[PDB]
Ligand binder design. Structure first.
Ligand SMILES: C#Cc1c(F)ccc2cccc(-c3ncc4c(N5CCN(C(=O)CCO)CC5)nc(OC[C@@]56CCCN5C[C@H](F)C6)nc4c3F)c12
Ligand SMILES: Nc1nc2c(ncn2[C@@H]2O[C@H](COP(=O)(O)OP(=O)(O)O)[C@@H](O)[C@H]2O)c(=O)[nH]1
Ligand SMILES: [Mg+2]
Length: 169
């Protein structure tokens, strides 16, 4: 089948692991060990094509070695996650895009911006603000909830679609 290497990045506690496990195992996990970095795979049909998603749920220490660079560089698309009730996680997005562009050595990298925890009442990041930033980046923006599963498939499948477009260009 066709393989897609997805990488999930973003500040600690934005819901990277919860989103990944929601997509793979269809249930909400709270208090998942924040230090554990793992790859999860799933076979799915997206727009008529059988895909093998290979999803890197990033964690561990913030380290910039040639090795780590090389590892990140094998990612084909990046899910850039912030939490809508954490403004700092949103302003961290610039930094992750910067690192992704650096190791991919390109301004054109399949990416999707994700505003997670849209189930919460205490929003601090306007939907419109994230939409506009995403538009400046030239990428899709989706609001998700790993807790309720709202738009979780949308987010990941949108990234697959972006990688697919990149491959055909
Ligand atoms: C992420 C990422 C990343 C890419 F997306 C692309 C290429 C990369 C190349 C080298 C390194 C990274 C990368 N590594 C991890 C990273 C990481 N981790 C990993 C996961 N963490 C936890 O899960 C908490 C408990 O452990 C802690 C912080 N954190 C950051 O940014 C964190 C901040 C806060 C303090 C300073 N630092 C710079 C900004 F200000 C935000 N970047 C990472 C990075 F770019 C790349
Ligand atoms: N209400 C709500 N809480 C969430 C959501 N996603 C994650 N969380 C909680 O936020 C905390 C951090 O989630 P986690 O997936 O470990 O974040 P990570 O550090 O980015 O991997 C956990 O307690 C989760 O239960 C969400 O969509 N809604
Ligand atoms: Mg985690």
């Amino acid at each position: 089948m066709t393989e897609y290497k997805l990488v999930v990045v973003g500040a600690d506690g934005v819901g990277k692991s919860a989103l990944t496990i929601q997509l793979i195992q269809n249930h909400f996990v709270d208090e998942y060990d924040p230090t554990i970095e793992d790859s999860y795979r799933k076979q799915v049909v997206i727009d008529g094509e059988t895909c093998l998603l290979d999803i890197l749920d990033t964690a561990g220490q913030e380290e910039y070695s040639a090795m780590r660079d090389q590892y990140m560089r094998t990612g084909e698309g990046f899910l850039c996650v912030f939490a809508i009730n954490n403004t700092k996680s949103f302003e961290d997005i610039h930094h992750y895009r910067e690192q992704i562009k650096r190791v991919k050595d390109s301004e054109d990298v399949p990416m999707v911006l994700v505003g997670n925890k849209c189930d919460l009442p205490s929003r601090t990041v306007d939907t419109k603000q994230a939409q506009d930033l995403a538009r400046s980046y030239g990428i899709p923006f989706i609001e998700t909830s790993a807790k309720t599963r709202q738009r979780v498939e949308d987010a990941f499948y949108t990234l697959v679609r972006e990688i697919r477009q990149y491959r055909l260009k």
